[PDB]
């Protein structure tokens, strides 16, 4: 109907049964809206854990990007949705995915002061030396913003990774 919710809205609102019906009726599990967003991106952005799980189980593509090169991972990282980040990482996504701003999942996790997400990303190979468009990396951001626990996590990771310093 004219006022029926889109697949993106069903996913964002946690309407599991209606979403399951819709994706059976039409091939819309990866359908992109006017901003390029998939149902997975809407679910991830709204912290809908059960819907993210359901979409991934049903084969939704977690690697797709919106018109601004937004990814489900970066959206979840920016909001600190640790369990959704874990599911997406378990899928196999690019942990260093760049958007049109030069942002990456780690940079968003650092910006939001989401230490569990920062830890998880680093464990999955996120590179804290990748820079924004203005040339600042994750370490630079953690320092600038005074997020000390985040800074510690990043610095300890780098100390272990670097083989020129013991």
């Amino acid at each position: 109907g004219a006022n029926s919710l889109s697949v993106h809205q069903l996913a964002a609102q946690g309407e599991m049964l209606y979403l399951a019906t819709r994706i059976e009726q039409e091939n819309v599990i990866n359908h992109t809206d006017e901003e390029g967003f998939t149902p997975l991106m809407w679910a991830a952005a709204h912290g809908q854990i059960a819907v993210v799980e359901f979409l991934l189980q049903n084969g939704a593509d977690p690697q797709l990007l919106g018109k601004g090169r937004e990814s489900a991972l970066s959206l979840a990282c920016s909001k600190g949705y640790t369990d959704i980040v874990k599911m997406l990482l378990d899928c196999g996504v690019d942990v260093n995915e760049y958007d049109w701003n030069g942002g990456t999942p780690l940079l968003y996790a650092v910006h939001g002061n989401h230490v569990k997400c920062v830890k998880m990303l680093l464990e999955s190979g996120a590179d804290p030396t990748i820079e924004t468009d203005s040339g600042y990396n994750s370490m630079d951001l953690a320092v600038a913003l005074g997020y000390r626990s985040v800074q510690q996590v990043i610095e300890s990771h780098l100390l272990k990774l670097l083989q020129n310093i013991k």
Binding site: A12, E35, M41, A44, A45, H46, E70, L75, G112
Partner: peptide
Amino acid sequence: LPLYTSPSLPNITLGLP
């Protein structure tokens, strides 16, 4: 009704715009 909170990533820049 629909949510108007469309997915968005924040501005993460430092220094002046």
